[PDB]
């Protein structure tokens, strides 16, 4: 869990 969103570059998935 974490895989689907570090706080900035991308978003969810
Ligand atoms: C949450 O997304 C944790 C990531 C799961 C790690 C599973 C190991 C993968 C390499 C064997």
Number of helices, where a helix is a run of at least 4 consecutive DSSP H or I residues: 0
Task: Count the E strands.
Answer: 0
State the share of residues found in helices, binned by percent. Answer: under 10%
Which descriptor suits the 3D outline? flat
The distinct bound ligands, ions and cofactors come out as: decanoic acid
* Fraction of residues in β-strands: under 5%
If you had to describe this structure to a student in words, what would you say it looks like?
The PDB classes it as antibiotic. Keywords: antibiotic, calcium-dependent. The assembly is monomeric. By secondary structure, the chain is low in regular secondary structure. It is 0% helix and 0% strand. It has no helix or strand. Bound molecules: decanoic acid. Decanoic acid binds at residues 1-3.
């Amino acid at each position: 869990w974490x895989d689907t969103g570090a706080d900035x570059d991308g978003x969810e998935w």
